[PDB]
């Protein structure tokens, strides 16, 4: 299975097991959901009846008053009372099997090929760290929303794509499943494809 380039008009060889396997939606879903869950901060709490500020004094005597029996002004039944099942800070992170993560990326990268969303180029850089230069290069290569993976994280290209919200620039080791789906197009350098293959196998 041979990928084709647009800038140089050449052929780049790739593994059939990495860029030419069927889309395992169920597997990709689990990894995407796991990634979103990994992004959660999980920083919150409410006060149980134990934590709400006030005395343990029984508001009124058990019997004789003619009112519902009360034990604590902190009862969750009461206004200003505890939350019955007060939240604690949680870790929402999920375990993703190494093989289930790699198999998910393989499924995603394979879809990007068939949907013609993966563009392969020999070299992708700009002259100086100027957003105007990259912006111009993207309205020449004919894409607005795009994810750029490059071999060495060139400082100029990184800075030049920082103020463009629809454009993101990363290395081959910094690819994530969500970013390979979220972005309309993915523009990978020749070196990147020779780093991704070796990382997935």
């Amino acid at each position: 299975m041979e990928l084709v380039l647009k800038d140089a008009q050449s052929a780049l060889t790739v593994s059939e097991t990495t860029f030419g396997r069927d889309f395992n939606e169920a597997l990709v879903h689990q990894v995407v959901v796991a990634y979103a869950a990994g992004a959660r901060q999980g920083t919150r709490a409410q006060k149980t009846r134990a934590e709400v500020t006030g005395s343990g004094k029984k508001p009124w005597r058990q019997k004789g008053t003619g009112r519902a029996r009360s034990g604590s002004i902190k009862s969750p039944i009461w206004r200003s009372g505890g939350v019955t099942f007060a939240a604690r800070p949680q870790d929402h992170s999920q375990k993703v099997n190494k093989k289930m993560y790699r198999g998910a990326l393989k499924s995603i990268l394979s879809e990007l090929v068939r949907q013609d969303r993966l563009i392969v180029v020999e070299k992708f850089s700009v002259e100086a760290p100027k957003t105007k230069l990259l912006a111009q290069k993207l309205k020449d290569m004919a894409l607005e929303d795009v994810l750029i993976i490059t071999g060495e994280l060139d400082e100029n290209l990184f800075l030049a794509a920082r103020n463009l919200h629809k454009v993101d620039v990363r290395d081959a080791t910094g690819i994530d499943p969500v970013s390979l789906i979220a972005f309309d197009k993915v523009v990978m350098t020749a070196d990147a494809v020779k780093q991704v293959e070796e990382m997935l196998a």
């Binding site: 508001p59 009124w60 004789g64 008053t65 003619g66 009112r67």
Partner: peptide, 19 residues
């Protein structure tokens, strides 16, 4: 809502004793 109930106050009559 309901106000805090009163402590015991004098009662006019004894509860009848049934035994």
């Amino acid at each position: 809502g309901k106000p805090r109930p009163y402590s015991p106050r004098p009662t006019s009559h004894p509860r009848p004793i049934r035994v």
